[PDB]
Amino acid sequence: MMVISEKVRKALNEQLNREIYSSYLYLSMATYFDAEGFKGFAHWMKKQAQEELTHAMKFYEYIYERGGRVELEAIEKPPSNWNGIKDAFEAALKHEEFVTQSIYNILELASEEKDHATVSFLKWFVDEQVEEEDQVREILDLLEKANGQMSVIFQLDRYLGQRE
Amino acid sequence: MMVISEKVRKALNEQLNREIYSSYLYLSMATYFDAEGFKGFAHWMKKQAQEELTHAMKFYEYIYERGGRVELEAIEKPPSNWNGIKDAFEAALKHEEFVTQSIYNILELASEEKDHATVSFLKWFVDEQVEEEDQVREILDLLEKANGQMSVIFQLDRYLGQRE
Amino acid sequence: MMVISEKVRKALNEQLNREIYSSYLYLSMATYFDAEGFKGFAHWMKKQAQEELTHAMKFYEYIYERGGRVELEAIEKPPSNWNGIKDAFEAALKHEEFVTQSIYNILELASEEKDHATVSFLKWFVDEQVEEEDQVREILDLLEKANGQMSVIFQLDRYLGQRE
Amino acid sequence: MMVISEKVRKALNEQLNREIYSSYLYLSMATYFDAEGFKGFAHWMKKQAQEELTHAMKFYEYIYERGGRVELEAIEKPPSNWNGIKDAFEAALKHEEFVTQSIYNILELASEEKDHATVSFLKWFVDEQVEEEDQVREILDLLEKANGQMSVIFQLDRYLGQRE
Amino acid sequence: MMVISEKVRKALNEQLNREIYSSYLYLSMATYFDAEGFKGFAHWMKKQAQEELTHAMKFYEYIYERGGRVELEAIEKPPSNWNGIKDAFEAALKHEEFVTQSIYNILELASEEKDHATVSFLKWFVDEQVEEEDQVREILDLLEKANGQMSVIFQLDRYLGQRE
Amino acid sequence: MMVISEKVRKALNEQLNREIYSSYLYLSMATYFDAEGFKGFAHWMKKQAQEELTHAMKFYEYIYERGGRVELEAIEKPPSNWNGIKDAFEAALKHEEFVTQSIYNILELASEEKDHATVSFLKWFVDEQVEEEDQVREILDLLEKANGQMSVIFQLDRYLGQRE
Amino acid sequence: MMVISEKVRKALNEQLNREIYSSYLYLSMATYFDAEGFKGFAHWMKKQAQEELTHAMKFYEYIYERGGRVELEAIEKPPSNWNGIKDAFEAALKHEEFVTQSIYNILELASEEKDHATVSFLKWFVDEQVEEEDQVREILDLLEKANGQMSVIFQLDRYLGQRE
Amino acid sequence: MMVISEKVRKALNEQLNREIYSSYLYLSMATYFDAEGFKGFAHWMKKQAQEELTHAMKFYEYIYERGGRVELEAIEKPPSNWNGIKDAFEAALKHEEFVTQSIYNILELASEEKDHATVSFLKWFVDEQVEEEDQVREILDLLEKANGQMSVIFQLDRYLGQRE
């Protein structure tokens, strides 16, 4: 039987679907970067998409580990066009900060219900978000300093294209 | 500029989205199997899901390689329950046969427009489908030997759960 | 069930049987070369016999992979004597060319039925047939040059006796 | 010239062709096992078929080594269907026993003609036959113990499917 | 004897000479890049020239494999100048597309004559062209955004100058 | 700017083109040997063609090194047939000596203009020509002794066929 | 079922019991040497008893391989005293010769019944007996040269005591 | 001279003969299991038979070490059949417990005579008997859990056949 409340299971399941949309969003950003001829940015986004899927499966397993069941929901069509390089990364940061707040909402719900296990389990994602947001903020600061110069952008694209 | 016709690009892009759904459908089959207590069939479906993504990404890279662009579409909600294992795998088989025929449709279209590059590129998928379909027919035939015996179905669960 | 037509399965199965006779024929050629004291040429024919068997088995597995079944047919008695080294290889070439045309007939059949999986599958045999025919024409060219001089013929026998 | 009587040469040549039929019969049994979804048993049979061919070639070489010649004969169509796994293996055993007696008939003929060379050469086959019969009897015994339990039969299949 | 039709032999032989000119053109572009002091771009073109030679020799060998003969034709003087780096690459792309169409024309001819062996052999060149056109297109798009900036042009030179 | 006179530049560029024709002529000789079934002699000729290209590239680099530019010229159609092995190698020797005299001409021209750097650069080609001529004379001597005896020709062909 | 006649099985089973007695007999010789203070001789005899058991177990396994059954019979009390070292070894030799003849009798019976498998199987014991008798004769000859001299017997004892 | 009493020597010498019979009895149990198709249980008994012999030999050596002599007695015919598996092992246990008591009798006898060396020497055997009885009881316990399930009985057979 489930050892988590139906409320927490729902919250986790929806976060699972939320992570899947995140991954699909970043893939969409990759289709945009590839369209604009920036293989390095595209590459970074494909990796970011992959990392997001692992996050989703990490929620997947926990849900079953507590007797819960995962229900895959419809995934919405993501945007495919951005004004430019910086805008796409800006949207990536805004999206990360959104998933971080989504994580926060589950943590507060689990905390209110004294579901200490789930609260402990979420700690990892909190720390991971602080890391992802910082990555994007760095890229943005760099793009901001680049101020449109194709020379710096090309470097940035080459570097980000190195992400393992 | 695109060197593939708009008709072929569209056929390729829709197949790309179709692969993503196939992956999602298999993940959903996995949620069904995990909920029913069959980890083995679950593990297999997950692996089958990742394989379908690598397929989608091949369509992805080729579309760009031909000067086109990828556009990600909305992914409909997949079924989350089946009337038993056999019913599940049969839906899986039925689905693969459907993607195979989809693949066949692009190939005839490309062939008709004398787009030899796309016709040749599709060859790899035709061969994969032959392999994927055969693995499901195998499983279905093995389940058939179980003839309801659960102790046997559990043995097939432990085997499929060995997939690398 | 069978995802290949009865017509196609028959064409495959009959080709499989044809490949087995081919193997037996090359073995027979080996019995002739060994009786004439040419161990090297015999060795070559034995290697060629095994090759053809691997071809047979390739058709064998594909047939089952497409839900078909293989039925082994009676193998006719192959010739056991030839009018000299040249005559033997000439017969071998003639047979190889017959096998290729056979391969061709199955391909056009599958193509007419839009059985792309099978058309694709046959490509490998088409390329192998090109390689096999060429090996025999080279041998026949060298024999033509040898013009019956035991001196060079011994060399040919030695070289061919090196085939792995 | 031949240093074996024409009688012994004929008996050796007929045994060679008899080994080839054995090899073919075992392949036919493989067609049946594969048709029945038992890859493993089919594998064991494909290996058995190959082993039989090495035995035929061992008769082949001896014949030439005694100055004889080999003449390949037609190969009759073998049976392609059995009433279950146990029935196929029983027919295999029965076939083995038949080849064992075949080897005895030659041994006795050679011994009658005082062909000590050929008698000694046959010694190897007598010993091998004892081992080949034991193997099949061992398998039959495992099948009898399985007593229709698809569970253990699944294990047997996978086991025999490992034959090197 | 020739097993390919005279029409196909002629098409192949003409394509071999076409690949040779292609090699020579790319070398000519190297003469231009070196005259403009771009070692990296020149290097890339020298490597491309070699790649084309290997293609010509694959046609050479296939012609002999089908019993045909190669006849080398005169090679026309290629252009030795272009209006800047980008212009040279536009010319390269347009030339790569011409080669692809040339390959297409042979494929269709062979296909119409039912020369399956030749249609199959050409598949490799269809796939290689897709890859060659893509490299050039990628380079052109990068130069397009470079808009003549000497900074990025130097980055491109070095990068391309690494081609192995 | 150019530090070599236009006259010397012309002579070096024309020699570069001459080397390319040599390369092409040796390939042509290869098409003749392959057509006659002497793969070894064909191989040797293909290796000789490659060696001639490296020489062309030597001239190429020196021209740029002295501030000149290379201009690829049309390459004429070479003969494609000879009256036999001996005849072909003889035509090869005669061509090599033609190349040597050509090298002599540039050398005398550079020496008259006191272009010591070019005179010095040409020394390497004068010594290489000594080696090239000798290799063909050596082959011609063996063919002379062979006097048609296919027995030694085969050996000569396999030997030359081993050139690296 | 049994593939050996009841008469052969009987002969084999009885030989097994016979081998077991030999073992017991040699152990008894060990009890005599030990009592006489010759640990080395005792050691050799204990190893000999072990060898005899391994021989008995060879008959054991062969009997079941041919569908037979082993029935252990009573073991008679062996002598426990001898008139000296030499006497003990003469008795062992005489016993060995007895088993050799016993093997001979079974061999002859098997041969008469045309049971080639059993004849072949007994070959190993024929050769083994020749070697065993030889070891005992070798010891007897060393005891002869010894000529009652304790000095030499001490060495012989310590020596035979090294048998592994 | 004998430093052990004739009473203790006889009890030790009789125990040695008892251990040999125990060995033979367990071999007989193995003849029964093999006859019934259980190789595992037969394997087990074979190992048990060998273990008992080492016990015998330990008694053997100790007897000499105390200046006594060993006299091998006639060994009786052991039972060759049992009313099923359980019946055999139960007899085995009964026999184990019997040799245990026999050991106790010698121990109490030696103790009564103040033969401390013999009392100490027997300790090892008391401990080994505990180990052996426990093994047989565990086997019987598992046979009970098998509850006539031939399927399970074969599983145990395979387990005991792994004894080292």
Ligand SMILES: CCCCCCCCCCCCCCCCCCCC
């Ligand atoms: C590098 C390209 C990565 C593209 C990722 C695209 C993701 C699209 C979202 C759809 C969900 C797919 C389901 C996949 C589940 C995989 C589970 C693996 C478990 C080990």
Ligand SMILES: CCCCCCCCCCCCCCCCCCCC
């Ligand atoms: C060392 C030389 C080897 C010669 C091999 C000759 C084979 C001739 C084929 C005769 C046809 C008999 C059927 C054989 C079926 C073998 C199936 C193998 C399946 C793995």
Ligand SMILES: CCCCCCCCCCCCCCCCCCCC
């Ligand atoms: C390093 C720069 C490469 C320059 C290639 C220039 C090619 C010019 C075309 C002229 C024809 C030359 C003949 C080449 C024959 C090669 C044969 C290889 C056989 C394995």
Ligand SMILES: CCCCCCCCCCCCCCCCCCCC
């Ligand atoms: C270490 C010294 C060896 C002494 C051997 C004495 C043998 C006496 C014969 C009595 C028979 C006992 C039964 C032995 C069965 C052995 C089975 C082995 C199976 C691998």
